[PDB]
Ligand binder design. Structure first.
Ligand SMILES: C[C@@H](OCc1cnn[nH]1)c1cccc2c(-c3ccc(CS(C)(=O)=O)c(F)c3)c(C(=O)O)[nH]c12
Ligand SMILES: [Zn+2]
Ligand SMILES: [Zn+2]
Length: 231
């Protein structure tokens, strides 16, 4: 019943967590540079189909994700959106594509994934190239807040449930630094978070790219930890 953590997640297994009616997060763990991390994605019911947001960080994790969705939900995943180009978002796209899932990302994400040697979603999401842009995609809205954790990071809102999935632009309340900042814009990140706060003031649940969901406080906390990292 509590939100899953690594201590409950061996690398290779996947857990789902009900967030709201027709909204789950998925949680998996992965090793990277000799340390183990959790990471989140999202599942949104789309009538009798499912929309997936982000892979489960790796090929075997993503296969395990699909099997867990079949066990717990039993509806087919038909589309997936990756919210930036790092392996915790696109690693497993090849598994999805071989399982019949149509994979999508912004052109920016596709270019960055290709340049870095990461797996590449098939379809380009236009209409997201300027900060503040939003488009509909099934039961969600996709929003480009500006550069933050990465230049291409997207945010996802589920209007039926007022669920804000921040992806890696948003950190959990317990965080003590801004995570993996290799590709970040620390100077722009607070402005991008401010755009998220102005756009989605009625968000009830906020989900970070890694760690525990909470409320709107995650947004201000993220700005605070990023500013202190920069300083
Ligand atoms: C898949 C990959 O993405 C980075 C990358 C760079 N180049 N290519 N891939 C990745 C690999 C390994 C670790 C991470 C983390 C991370 C998240 C939170 C904390 C705890 S905290 C907020 O208090 O600091 C952290 F310590 C690290 C992130 C992210 O922050 O989103 N992305 C990671
Ligand atoms: Zn990332
Ligand atoms: Zn991340």
């Amino acid at each position: 019943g509590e939100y899953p953590t690594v201590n409950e997640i061996p690398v290779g297994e996947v857990r789902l967590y009900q967030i709201a009616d027709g909204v789950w997060s998925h949680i998996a763990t992965q090793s990277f540079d000799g340390a183990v991390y959790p990471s989140n994605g999202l599942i949104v019911r789309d009538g009798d189909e499912l929309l997936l947001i982000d892979t489960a960080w790796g090929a075997k994790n993503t296969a395990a994700l699909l099997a867990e969705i079949e066990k717990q939900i039993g509806l087919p995943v038909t589309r997936a959106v990756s919210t930036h180009f790092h392996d915790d978002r696109v690693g497993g796209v090849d598994v999805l594509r071989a399982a019949g899932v149509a994979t999508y990302a912004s052109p920016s994400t596709r270019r960055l994934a290709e340049a870095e040697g990461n797996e590449i979603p098939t379809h380009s999401l236009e209409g997201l190239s300027s900060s503040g842009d939003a488009v509909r995609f099934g039961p969600v809205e996709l929003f480009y807040p500006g550069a933050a954790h990465s230049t291409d990071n997207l945010v996802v809102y589920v209007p039926s449930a007022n669920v804000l999935y921040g992806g890696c632009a948003v950190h959990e309340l317990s965080s003590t630094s801004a995570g993996n900042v290799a590709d970040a814009d620390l100077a722009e990140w607070p402005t991008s978070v401010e755009r998220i706060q102005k756009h989605y003031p009625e968000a009830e649940v906020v989900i970070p790219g890694h760690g525990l969901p909470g409320g709107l406080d995650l947004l201000q906390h993220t700005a605070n930890v990023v500013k202190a990292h920069k300083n």
